[PDB]
DNA sequence: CTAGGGTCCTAGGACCC
DNA sequence: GGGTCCTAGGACCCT
């Protein structure tokens, strides 16, 4: 009863697309991200930039101090979406059991697959080869009996490689696996776990489930399970989008309501256009706004509302502005919609 | 020197039983 | 007192 889960993950996805479409960028350090003047961060970088230490989520000013010749690109999201659609179609030739996690990656459940003599290793290789053949982009892959191990495995032989974890290999793999490598164990959790002496899954194996539940709630059960290779989450091909957001960080903090309202007037048409792609009648469950202050505190305020409405968003932003700003500058303004349940 | 697109979990009071 | 809804905040994920 052992499943075969493949995780496919494009290499340096945004950058890889820009090097394909502009071979001049292949061998110089490049990154997709907002400029230092826009107070941007790196979305991703190519391997020439990563050699300097450039990483996703790094402030662009930090990226540029590490790599002064870094070439900064704005991003062509329709080009990324197009490659995404293509690889998802390539996935469908092998199975309908496809759970995309983002543009550039998906889980595949090939447990019941007839391709490649049922070899999940050979399927992942065919899929990566096909992606290369048809998109001239490389992908890496992980093969394992459960989702999270497959996702970890796809990083281990990046780029343009794959890694297989068999059930017999699972205990040795877990023993020294850093907790931080588990998807959903982030910096804050890893630091909490570290300060109680828990660094690896092998450390957590020596822990009592009851203690983990008291100390972390349902997250503690997840930690206990994962540390044992337990991950019963099924590949789910039926997930639906729940929200639509549009937000902008300004190059300088704003201090006047007039400036905030001007920002919203430019954000609203974009929110309407994106909502309309998925809900032509603009019917929604909730709408709301987001402010981020100069001290990086963030507040949202959102409410039940039947249909995207600009004036109510301005009104709500005005209340938030007046009521929760306390004289701080504002670096970000955002609009938000929660979609109806079906 | 700190983005923009999101999902999920938690938690208190409201409301309903 | 128990469910569920409403709401805000925050960890976390991808690039
Ligand atoms: Mg990737
Ligand atoms: Mg990915």
A57 torsion bin: left (phi>0), alpha (psi -120 to 50), beta (else): left
Judge if A180 and A44 occupy the same domain: no
Task: For residue A304, give every residue at least 6 positions away whose Cβ sits within 8 Å of its Cβ, in sequence order, or none.
Answer: A285, A286
Contact between A7 and A47 under an 8 Å Cβ cutoff? The reply is no
Q: Give the Cα separation of A260 and A207 in Å (integer).
A: 51
Task: For residue A292, give every residue at least 6 positions away whose Cβ sits within 8 Å of its Cβ, in sequence order, or none.
Answer: A249, A298, A330, A331, A332, A334
Q: Give the Cα separation of A83 and A92 in Å (integer).
A: 14
CB atoms within 10 A of CB A186: 10
Judge if A1 and A89 occupy the same domain: yes
Task: Count structural domains, chain A.
Answer: 4
Task: For residue A269, give every residue at least 6 positions away whose Cβ sits within 8 Å of its Cβ, in sequence order, or none.
Answer: none
3-state secondary structure of A185: coil
Sheet with A42-45, strands from edge to edge, namely A42-45, A30-33, A71-73
Task: For residue A60, give every residue at least 6 positions away whose Cβ sits within 8 Å of its Cβ, in sequence order, or none.
Answer: A31, A33, A34, A35, A36, A38, A39, A40, A41, A42, A72
CA angle A317, A319, A324 (to 5 degrees): 95
Judge if A187 and A280 occupy the same domain: no
Of A82, A91, A106, A89, the closest CA to residue A14 belongs to A82
Strand partners, A299: A291
Task: For residue A85, give every residue at least 6 positions away whose Cβ sits within 8 Å of its Cβ, in sequence order, or none.
Answer: none
Ligand having the closest approach to the CA of A17 = 1
Q: Give the Cα separation of A224 and A216 in Å (integer).
A: 11
Judge if A200 and A218 occupy the same domain: yes
Q: What is the CATH number of the domain that holds A288?
A: 3.30.1490.100
Task: Say if residue A159 is preceded by a cis peptide, omega within 30 of 0.
Answer: yes
- Residues of the binding site of A: 9, 104
Q: b or e along A248-263 (b: 16 or more beta carbons within 10 Å of the residue's beta carbon)?
A: bbbeebbeeeeebeeb
Which tokens sit at A206?
């020596």
Judge if A40 and A162 occupy the same domain: no
**Protein residues near ligand 2, an ion, with CB under 5 A:** A 9, 104-105
Q: Give the Cα separation of A319 and A307 in Å (integer).
A: 20
Q: Give the Cα separation of A186 and A219 in Å (integer).
A: 12
Q: What is the CATH number of the domain that holds A216?
A: 1.10.150.20
Chain B bases closer than 7 A to any CB of the protein: 1-11
Task: Name residue, tokens 């790599």.
Answer: A67
Task: Name residue, tokens 């350090």.
Answer: A29
Residue closest to C12 C1′ by Cα: A184
Residue closest to C10 C1′ by Cα: A298
Judge if A259 and A208 occupy the same domain: no
Q: Give the Cα separation of A244 and A335 in Å (integer).
A: 9
- Residues of the binding site of A for Mg(2+): 9, 104
Q: Give the Cα separation of A232 and A98 in Å (integer).
A: 16
Task: Name residue, tokens 């309908």.
Answer: A96
The residues of A annotated as belonging to the active site are 105
Judge if A158 and A10 occupy the same domain: yes
Strand partners, A105: A9, A102
Longest Cα pair distance anywhere in chain A, in angstroms? 66
- Alpha helices, H only, A38-186: 47-50, 60-66, 77-92, 120-135, 147-156, 170-175
Judge if A277 and A293 occupy the same domain: yes
- Through-space distance between the first and last CA atoms of chain A, rounded to whole angstroms: 33
Domain interval for residue A14? 1-21+75-175
Of A68, A13, A9, the closest CA to residue A45 belongs to A13
In the reported structure, the alpha carbon of residue A146 is separated from the centroid of ligand 1 by a whole-number distance in angstroms of 19
Judge if A30 and A154 occupy the same domain: no
CA distance readout (Å), A306 to A66, A234, A240, A340? 48, 33, 19, 9
Judge if A40 and A98 occupy the same domain: no
Within a domain: A262: yes
Phi, psi of A162 (to 5 degrees): -150, 165
CB-count burial class (<10 Å; 0-12, 13-18, 19+) for A33: buried
In the reported structure, the alpha carbon of residue A266 is separated from the centroid of ligand 1 by a whole-number distance in angstroms of 31
- Alpha helices, H only, chain A: 13-21, 47-50, 60-66, 77-92, 120-135, 147-156, 170-175, 187-195, 201-205, 209-216, 218-226, 257-278, 310-324
Within a domain: A27: yes
User: Domain boundary at A133, A155, A175, which?
Assistant: A175
Q: Give the Cα separation of A244 and A247 in Å (integer).
A: 10
Within a domain: A223: yes
Near-strand B residues (CB closer than 7 A)? A 34, 36, 39-41, 43, 56-57, 59, 61-62, 65, 102, 217-219, 239, 241-249, 270, 274, 296, 331-332, 334
Judge if A218 and A272 occupy the same domain: no
CA distance readout (Å), A17 to A45, A240, A315? 11, 26, 41
Strand partners, A304: A286
Task: For residue A167, give every residue at least 6 positions away whose Cβ sits within 8 Å of its Cβ, in sequence order, or none.
Answer: A2, A145
User: Domain boundary at A188, A205, A230, which?
Assistant: A230
How far: A67 CA to C15 C1' (Å)? 20
CB atoms within 10 A of CB A236: 11
Q: Give the Cα separation of A230 and A224 in Å (integer).
A: 8
In the reported structure, the alpha carbon of residue A121 is separated from the centroid of ligand 2 by a whole-number distance in angstroms of 19
In the reported structure, the alpha carbon of residue A140 is separated from the centroid of ligand 1 by a whole-number distance in angstroms of 8
How far: A61 CA to B1 C1' (Å)? 7
Q: What is the CATH number of the domain that holds A158?
A: 3.30.70.270
Judge if A15 and A149 occupy the same domain: yes
Q: How far is CA A275 from the centre of its chain?
A: 21
CA angle A114, A115, A120 (to 5 degrees): 100
Q: Give the Cα separation of A335 and A319 in Å (integer).
A: 14
Within a domain: A235: no
Contact between A109 and A123 under an 8 Å Cβ cutoff? The reply is no
Q: What is the CATH number of the domain that holds A46?
A: 3.40.1170.60
Contact between A297 and A304 under an 8 Å Cβ cutoff? The reply is no
Which tokens sit at A162?
């794959």
Within a domain: A330: yes
User: Domain boundary at A230, A257, A275, which?
Assistant: A230
Within a domain: A236: no
Within a domain: A237: no
Handedness of CA A321, A326, A329, A330 (dihedral sign): negative
CB-count burial class (<10 Å; 0-12, 13-18, 19+) for A62: middle
Length of chain A: 342
Question: Which experiment gave this structure?
Answer: X-ray
Angle between helix A209-216 and helix A218-226 axes, rounded to 10 deg = 140
Task: For residue A239, give every residue at least 6 positions away whose Cβ sits within 8 Å of its Cβ, in sequence order, or none.
Answer: A99
Task: For residue A326, give every residue at least 6 positions away whose Cβ sits within 8 Å of its Cβ, in sequence order, or none.
Answer: none
3-state secondary structure of A240: coil
């Amino acid at each position: 009863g052992s499943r075969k889960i493949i995780h496919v993950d494009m290499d340096c996805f945004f950058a890889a697309v820009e090097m394909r479409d502009n071979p001049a960028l292949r061998d110089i350090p490049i990154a997709i991200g907002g400029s230092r003047e826009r107070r941007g961060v790196i979305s991703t970088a190519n391997y020439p930039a990563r050699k300097f230490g450039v990483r996703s989520a790094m402030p662009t000013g930090m990226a540029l101090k590490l790599c002064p010749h870094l070439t900064l690109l704005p991003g062509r999201f329709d080009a990324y979406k197009e490659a995404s659609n293509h690889i998802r179609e390539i996935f469908s030739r092998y199975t309908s059991r496809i759970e995309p996690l983002s543009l550039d990656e998906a889980y595949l459940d090939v447990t019941d697959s007839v391709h490649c003599h049922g070899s999940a290793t050979l399927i992942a290789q065919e899929i990566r080869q096909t992606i290369f053949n048809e998109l001239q982009l490389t992908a890496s892959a992980g093969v394992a009996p459960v989702k999270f191990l497959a996702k970890i495995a796809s990083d281990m032989n990046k780029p343009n490689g794959q890694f297989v974890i068999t059930p017999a290999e699972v205990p040795a793999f877990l023993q020294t696996l850093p907790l931080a490598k588990i998807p959903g164990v982030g910096k804050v959790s890893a630091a909490k776990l570290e300060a109680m002496g828990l660094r690896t899954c092998g450390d957590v194996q020596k822990c009592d489930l009851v203690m983990l539940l008291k100390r972390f709630g349902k997250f503690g059960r997840i930690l206990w399970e994962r540390s044992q290779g337990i991950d019963e989450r099924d590949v789910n091909s039926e997930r639906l989008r729940k929200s639509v957001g549009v937000e902008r960080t300004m190059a300088e903090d704003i201090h006047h309501w007039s400036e905030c309202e001007a920002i919203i007037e430019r954000l609203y048409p974009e929110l309407e256009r994106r909502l309309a792609k998925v809900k032509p009648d603009l019917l929604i469950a909730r709408q709301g706004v987001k402010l981020k202050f100069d001290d990086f505190q963030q507040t949202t305020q959102e409410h039940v509302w039947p249909r995207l409405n600009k004036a109510d968003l301005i009104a709500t932003a005005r209340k938030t502005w007046d009521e929760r700003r306390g004289g701080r500058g504002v670096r970000l303004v955002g609009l938000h919609v929660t979609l109806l349940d079906p």
